[PDB]
Structure formats: C-alpha cells, structure tokens
C-alpha cells in the first residue's frame, strides 16, 4: 500500500490518501459506514465512545478496514502501510497470551481515541507483532485551514514490529516538508534496524531503503504536484513503469518494473522476467484502490474512492485478458476501469 498525507500550499487543506496494495482476488469491496452507540466501559454511566461513527474502505465479512483507511467521527483519520518484520529473532514476541491481534487493536483504538496520542496509546497495548504497520493518525481537529504549524497533534506516526512500538508526533515534520508519504518501509531507524531491513538494503539495495526506494523517490519528486483532490487521486494511482526512470529495476530483466510505482501493477511484469526477489515478479497483486479525504470531506465523514488496479497510464486490468483469468474472482467485474466516486 501507498499513503500520502499532503499539506496543500498555504496550508489551504490537508489531504489524506491511501492506496491498498493487495491480491487482485481481494477486489470485492465495501465502503462501510458504521453508526454505533458503544460506551467506553461495561456500564451505562460510561460515556459514548469517541469513535462511534466511522467510514472506512473494507471487504465483505471484514468488520474493520484491512487497508487500512478510516475516517472517524472523532475527527481522526487513521491509515496504514505495512512494514512487516524480517528479523526472525523477534517472532518470540508473537504469543497467544498477552497479544491482541492487530485488527482488534485497530478497531479498539479507532473507537476509544479522541486524538493521535490516545490512539497510539490504546493501539500499542498487547502488541501482537502481527500486521506490523506504520500507522498514520491525522487529527483534523488540530488542523486549522491556512493556519501555521500548531507544533503537535495533527500527525502521529506509530510503527509496530514484534516487541516494539515506536510513536512520535510528526506534525512539525509534516508542516516543514509539507507531506508524509508511506510505502511499506519503517521510518523509525530503531524499527528499521530491529526488523532486519539493513541486511536487505545490503543485499538488494535501494528498494529496501527508506529514502531511496522507488516510491520514496517518486513521492519526493512528485508529491508537490498534489495541489488538490484529483491531483492526489492521480499520484496515488500513479504507475507509468515503462517510461518512468524511477520504475527501473537495475537487477531486473527487463528493467522497467510495474511494482516500482505508487500504484503497483505486478500483473504487467513479464512471467519470464528475471527478478532479484519475489515482490518484483509477475503477480495478481498491486494497487487496488485509492481513498482520499480532506478537512471538509472528513468533517462530513466522506471520501473520494476509486476501485481497481490503476489504468491512468497502464492498460486497464481485465481478468479474462490477463495471465490470471483462471483465478477465482467470483462476483468481480472482469474489466477494471472505474473512476473515483464520492462516498457518499
């Protein structure tokens, strides 16, 4: 998955977008609005939770996002991209007792939090070391359109690996750089190091680098071009791997690789291609959506959402016209050429 949190010029708006990378077989999609009346505690004297209203991109039978991307009635927007763990010595921190699975921790944090600090505080309890993500918590309550950096509370970054959760308020960095990009690589060097990413940088190079991987590089190059909602959609849909030098995989033959874009299209990689590691192969996997919100849109519990693999500069994905026609995809459109829609 890719995410981008973009401060518009003049702080005019704060756009938050996430693009799920997933197996194409997962493309039965539901955008869900829950309007609940849960209380913080087991007694009726307990206040209603902060996160009783929530809209999120989801899937059938999936009682959380999975993407993740949520707009909460507490004014928070929560999203993640997955970092995982490549250090086998951390797996001993994955235990059946004392570990609440990530999806529940996510739902619980979403429900109880009124701000980024408390979301991080709730979520990190009983860290399971599973679904190891970088979470971004945008608190739109701390966002003043046109206002200068408030110093804190707008952006909280949380990174989880087994046995370790690191949390920082990254508002200052957001306001300074004007963006926060996420692309499956931990930002915290302690998390990057503890999860064995240095060895993969050493073995494979920039692809595993926080700052030099293709998506980091494309975001560094192109993020400022996100000047509005459609420009955000466009960068989040971005794949022009045949022509973009940033999409070049030097250890690959051929060199253009459809994985190396904001919205991956692994399906477009040749099957007989030579690739240094599995991510870069031909796969029924890539970016399968974009969801975007803004200060005003979040306020109205609303998003721009586009479903399906990117077709801006790549041929539209079509199951029957793909190496993957035989894969089970019941209920799914054959051809994926859907435009963003306001939801709702």
């Amino acid at each position: 998955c890719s995410a981008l949190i973009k401060l518009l010029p003049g702080g005019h708006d704060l756009l938050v977008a996430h693009n799920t990378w997933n197996s194409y077989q997962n493309m039965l999609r539901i955008i869900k609005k829950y309007r609940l009346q849960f209380r913080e505690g087991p007694q009726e004297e307990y206040p209603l939770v902060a996160g009783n209203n929530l809209v999120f991109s989801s899937y059938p039978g999936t009682i959380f996002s999975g993407d993740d991307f949520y707009i909460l009635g507490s004014g928070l927007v929560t999203l993640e991209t997955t970092i995982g763990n490549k250090n086998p010595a951390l797996w001993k921190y994955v235990q059946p007792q004392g570990c609440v699975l990530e999806w529940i921790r996510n739902v619980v944090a979403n429900r109880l939090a009124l701000d980024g600090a408390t979301w991080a505080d709730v979520f990190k309890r009983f860290n399971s070391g599973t679904y190891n993500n970088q979470w971004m918590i945008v608190d739109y309550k701390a966002f003043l359109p046109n206002g200068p950096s408030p110093g804190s509370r707008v952006l909280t970054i949380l990174e989880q690996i087994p046995g370790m959760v690191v949390v920082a308020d990254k508002t200052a960095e957001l306001y300074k750089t004007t963006y926060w990009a996420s692309y499956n690589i931990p930002y915290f060097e302690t998390v990057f190091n503890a999860s064995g990413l240095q060895a993969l940088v050493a073995q494979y190079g920039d692809w595993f680098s926080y700052t030099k991987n293709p998506r980091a590089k494309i975001f560094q190059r192109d993020q400022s071009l996100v000047e509005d909602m459609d420009a955000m959609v466009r960068l989040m849909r971005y794949n022009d791997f045949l022509h973009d030098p940033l999409s070049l995989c030097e250890a690959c033959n051929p060199k253009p690789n459809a994985e190396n874009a904001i919205s991956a299209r692994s399906d477009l990689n040749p099957a007989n291609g030579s690739y240094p590691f599995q991510a870069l192969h031909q796969r029924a996997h890539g970016g399968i959506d974009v969801k975007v919100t803004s200060f005003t849109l979040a306020k109205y519990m609303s998003m721009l959402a586009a479903s399906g693999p990117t077709w801006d500069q790549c041929p539209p994905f079509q199951w029957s016209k793909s190496p993957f026609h035989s894969m089970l995809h019941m209920g799914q459109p054959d051809l994926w050429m859907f435009s963003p829609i306001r939801v709702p």
Partner: protein, 180 residues
C-alpha cells in the same frame, strides 16, 4: 449475486425475547443495515449500518455483525471463496503450520475470553468484547442461527475470524515457522 439494495434489521422481541431478522428499515430494532451494491458500476458496494443506543452495547455489537452478514451474504460467500476458502483447509500440506496456527488462535481467543471475565470493569476489554461480539454475530447470522452470548463465547479460529486476520497472518505465518 447481490441485489442493488438490501435492508435488514434485527429486532429483539419484547416477549420471546429472541432476536429475529426482518426485511427493511426498523429503527426500533437493535441494529439495521443497508447494502447498496454498485460493484458493476463503480467497483464498490456501500454498507451503512446503525445500532440502537437504547440497547446495551454488547447486544448492539452482536446485532451489528448480524445485520451486516444478512445484507451481504452473497458478497461474503464470494469473498471467502476468492480469498481464504482453501487456507488451512481439510487437505492442507502444511499440517504442522495449520495445527500450530489453530493452537495459537484458540489459545489467543481463550486468553481474551479469560481477560474479559477477569476484568468485567475494564474499558479496554469491554471494547475487545464488543469487537468479538460483532464478529460472533456476523458469523452466527451468516450461518443462520442467532445466539446472543451474555457471558463468554467461542469464536471459531478458522471461521470469519479468517477474514479479519489476513494482515495478521502475514506475520503469524513466519512466526509459526511456515515455509517459505
């Protein structure tokens, strides 16, 4: 094969006092859900779901799962078929992994059930319990049999839990020594 729109409510019967699904909108119900399927046109379905605050939140969570299941049955079936149907199925090779995973998931689920019992006043564990009730109601409903638990309940490790833990499994797999 989902309809454009489906609306279901789960009522608690004054007398019975049993939960029963009804078609349509009933804001007297514990919960109601509305699925609009626009997948063919937009690549999205849309669900909205409300629970009634005049019932306690346990019943609401359970009912929330129930109503979601009832308006999205076909989508659930198809998603299950597309994604996790075979995962640790009757014929798995990785019986070592799958048995470890079942053990892990059962122990995990039991640990949370135990924590909920040991901590009836906990906000945290309360929120966990609501999340699991919603899961339970979703599965119960899909199965066509509503049993609202007032105390501890069992979640099938490889039932609808499987749809929730896909991201968790990415790490459970290597942690439980699955090959790759």
């Amino acid at each position: 094969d989902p309809p454009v729109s489906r609306t279901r409510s789960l009522l608690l019967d004054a007398a019975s006092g049993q939960l029963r699904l009804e078609d349509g909108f009933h804001p007297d119900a514990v919960a109601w859900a509305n699925l609009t399927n626009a997948i063919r046109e937009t690549g999205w379905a849309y669900l909205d779901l409300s629970t009634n605050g005049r019932y306690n939140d346990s019943l609401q969570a359970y009912a929330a799962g129930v109503v979601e299941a009832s308006v999205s049955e076909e989508l659930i079936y198809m998603h299950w078929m597309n994604t996790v149907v075979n995962y640790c199925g009757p014929f798995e090779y990785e019986v070592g992994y799958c048995e470890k995973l079942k053990n892990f998931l059962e122990a995990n689920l039991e640990w949370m059930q135990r924590e909920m019992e040991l901590n009836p006043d906990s906000p945290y564990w309360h929120q966990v319990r609501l999340t699991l009730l919603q899961l339970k109601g979703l599965e119960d409903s899909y199965e066509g049999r509503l049993t609202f638990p007032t105390g501890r309940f069992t979640i099938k490790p490889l039932g609808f839990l499987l749809l929730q833990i896909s991201g968790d499994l990415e790490d459970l797999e290597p942690a439980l020594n699955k090959t790759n």
